[PDB]
């Protein structure tokens, strides 16, 4: 029996339980966005704004249900409407991460027919982050 | 008259007011578990998650009565159902504390007829903890 660690083991939604995505694996996900005609977009957040929190609820009556702070991140530029070139997406990942090297950065895509985000995963975490585990240290 | 110190004098429920349990004393408590057919289990927590707190109540209406955070700790493996060997319990104490040397660790036991925890005491605190007193410094 191995024990799943509760300490410094924060996750990041889709694909966070897999090995870190290689450049090839990221490129494949971008190909999937383009093949399905979805709208790519990048979003980012400083470390203090990265994970859901409750702070604004101090202002509320009994209406906290499904309210959390830090669900919204900050948009990098605009969603890439009409983009059918995976290389353009990859270039924006580079541009965003270069501009904000200490930020969390996620790649997302939108479906305008369902009007919902249809995919998303983390592409950068700050080098100073110590609240997560490499795959081989998630259990002990 | 001696004065009971209010500063850095945190306790840990059952047996915290006695001298620290020797290896022999811990062994005797394990014998008591086994003699009574109770189910041993280990639980652990990082320092920030060790003592009761109120933080989640920010999300509540007027329903905080007997709600506290940090009552649940994290289970080490599973409860030791069917265990009748005190040496197996002691070995798991060593394994738990080895894996989590900076965590608080407590030994507990369950009675499945009452369906309640029927014993429990702390077996490890972090070496960095400065919020408790040795027995002879509890009063001044």
């Amino acid at each position: 029996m191995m024990v799943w660690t509760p300490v410094n083991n924060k996750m990041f939604e889709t694909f966070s339980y897999l090995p870190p995505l290689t450049d090839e694996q990221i490129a494949a996900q971008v190909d999937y966005i383009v093949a399905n005609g979805w709208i790519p977009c990048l979003e980012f957040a400083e470390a203090d704004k990265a994970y859901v929190s409750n702070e604004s609820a101090i202002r509320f009556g009994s209406v906290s249900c499904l309210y959390y702070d830090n669900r919204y991140w900050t948009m990098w530029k605009l969603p890439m409407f009409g983009c059918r070139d995976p290389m353009q997406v990859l270039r924006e990942i580079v541009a965003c991460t270069k501009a904000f090297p200490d930020a969390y950065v996620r790649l997302v895509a939108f479906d305008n027919q369902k009007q919902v985000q249809i995919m998303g995963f983390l592409v950068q975490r700050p080098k100073t982050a110590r609240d997560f585990q490499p795959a081989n240290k998630r259990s002990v | 008259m001696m004065v009971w110190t209010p500063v850095n004098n945190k306790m840990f429920e059952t047996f915290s007011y006695l001298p620290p349990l020797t290896d022999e004393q811990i062994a005797a408590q394990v014998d008591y578990i086994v003699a009574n057919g109770w189910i041993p289990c280990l639980e652990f927590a990082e320092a920030d998650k060790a003592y009761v707190s109120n933080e989640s109540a920010i999300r509540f209406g007027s329903v905080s009565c007997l709600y506290y955070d940090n009552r649940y700790w994290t289970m080490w493996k599973l409860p030791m159902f069917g265990c009748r060997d005190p040496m197996q319990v002691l070995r798991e104490i060593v394994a738990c504390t080895k894996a989590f040397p900076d965590a608080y660790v407590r030994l507990v036991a369950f009675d499945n007829q009452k369906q309640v925890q029927i014993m429990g005491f702390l077996v490890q605190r972090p070496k960095t903890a400065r919020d408790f007193q040795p027995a002879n410094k509890r009063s001044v």
């Binding site: - | 429920e13 059952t14 007011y17 009761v52 009565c65 309640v116 429990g120």
Partner: protein
């Protein structure tokens, strides 16, 4: 068979010694002392009649219904050994006679009028068999022992409490000051005295606020959950509920109620409020000894304890055996089992007249309180085991070094006795050694041991089995 006006013997209708009791009948065991010249069969029949369907003369309206279906039945009478004029009369009552969920109604029938009958010299209700079909009509205790321990995160030892003293006369601010000092030293609970409600010297809402401050201070200081039983006992149901609502709104864990002086109707309402709002409910048995002390007349506490478990309470005072108030060891243990356990077998040697099946109704935590101190700790742990609250009022606030050292003394004593038991020591034989060793280790405990070393409460027992 038609209507004949006039008086006839109760025994012609209400003495049925060949009756086979049904598993849904409520049974009563009465210790009855007939007037001279009144046959025990007629007395038992009268008790059965006047607590169920009958009166002193024949009524025509019986014919519209079925007396066979509804009558109470005296089904057995046994003479009491060593008594020339005492009998145990057993009465069976059909379940249809009772309002569902109402302890009030059950008492009104069984003990309403029969104790005043000229034809008897004395009457005592010794026991009641509450059948599962009637037990299931009650909400019962708001939480019960397991849930209470789980909410408090407290396991592996008795709980420790303390009544603030002087009983009356402290201000709200001084009340909270005393509470904080007690709790911070190692007590789990403090409590309002039974008679602390709202008074000129201290109004309730002021007390509740200062006590909340004290609870939260001690909890933050010790890292252990703390509570104080805030008294909701009041002159009216509306006032009682206001007090419960304030406790809810302060987020505190526990309130208390004096179930006999407030009464069963209020108590049951309060227990339902506590269930619905997550408050623990400590029950104080103030006035019980008016009713339950004497062997020849009244109602034995075993019945009053069953009634409370039905009406609802998370804790109930049980007596101590060794303290300032009366209650012998074996009788105390009978209360403990009847209030905690799911099933208690008939055992006449214990004063248990009927097998009692609780059909999974939660257990009530027994509370030992009244003139107890550190030297009693091994006996208390031996009697009650872990599932009890042991309360030291004078035994904490009478410590020469003050409340926090007083609390620490009690906590060390309890933990030392618990550890010794777990290690295999026999507290009944080695308890003295266990407490003595502890008094030699802890300065706080040593100070308590010295003050109370000679203090014992040893008197002839009135309520003997």
């Amino acid at each position: 068979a038609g209507f004949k006006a006039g008086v006839k013997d109760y025994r012609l209708t209400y003495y049925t010694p060949d009756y086979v009791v049904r598993d849904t009948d409520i049974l009563a065991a009465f210790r009855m002392t007939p007037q001279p010249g009144v046959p025990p069969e007629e007395c038992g029949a009268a008790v059965a009649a006047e607590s169920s369907t009958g009166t002193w003369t024949t009524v025509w309206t019986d014919g519209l219904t079925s007396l066979d279906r509804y009558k109470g039945r005296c089904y057995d009478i046994e003479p009491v050994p060593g008594e020339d004029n005492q009998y145990i009369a057993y009465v069976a009552y059909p379940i249809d006679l009772f309002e569902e969920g109402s302890v009030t109604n059950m008492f009104t029938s069984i003990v309403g009028n029969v104790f005043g009958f000229k034809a008897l010299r004395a009457l005592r209700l010794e026991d009641l068999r509450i059948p599962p079909a009637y037990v299931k009509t009650f909400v019962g205790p708001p939480h019960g022992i397991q849930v209470e321990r789980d909410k408090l995160n407290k396991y592996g030892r008795g709980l420790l409490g303390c009544t603030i003293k002087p009983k009356l006369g402290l201000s709200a601010k001084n009340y909270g000051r005393a509470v904080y000092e007690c709790l911070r030293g190692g007590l789990d609970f403090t409590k309002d005295d039974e008679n602390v409600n709202s008074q000129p010297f201290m109004r309730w809402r002021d007390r509740f606020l200062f006590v909340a401050e004290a609870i939260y201070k001690a909890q933050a200081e010790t890292g252990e959950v703390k509570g104080h039983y805030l008294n909701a006992t009041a002159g009216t149901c509306e006032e009682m509920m206001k007090r419960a609502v304030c406790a809810k709104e302060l987020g505190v864990p526990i309130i208390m109620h004096d179930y006999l002086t407030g009464g069963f109707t209020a108590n049951t309402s309060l227990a339902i409020y506590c269930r619905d709002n997550g408050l623990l409910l400590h029950i104080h048995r103030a006035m019980h000894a008016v009713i339950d002390r004497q062997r020849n007349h009244g109602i034995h506490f075993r019945v009053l304890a069953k009634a409370l478990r039905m009406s609802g309470g998370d804790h109930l005072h049980s007596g101590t055996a060794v303290g300032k108030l009366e209650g012998e060891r074996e009788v105390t243990l009978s209360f403990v089992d009847l209030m905690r356990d799911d099933y208690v077998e008939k055992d006449r040697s214990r004063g248990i007249y009927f097998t009692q099946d609780w059909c999974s109704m939660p257990g009530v935590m027994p509370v030992a309180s009244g003139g107890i101190h550190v030297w009693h700790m091994p006996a208390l742990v031996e009697i009650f085991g872990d599932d009890a609250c042991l309360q030291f009022g004078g035994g904490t606030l009478g410590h020469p070094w003050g409340n926090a050292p007083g609390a620490a003394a009690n906590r060390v004593a309890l933990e030392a006795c618990t550890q010794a038991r777990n290690e295999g020591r026999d507290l009944a034989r080695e308890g003295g050694d266990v407490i003595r060793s502890a008094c030699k280790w802890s300065p706080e405990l040593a100070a308590a041991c010295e003050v109370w070393k000679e203090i014992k409460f040893e008197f002839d027992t009135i309520d003997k089995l």
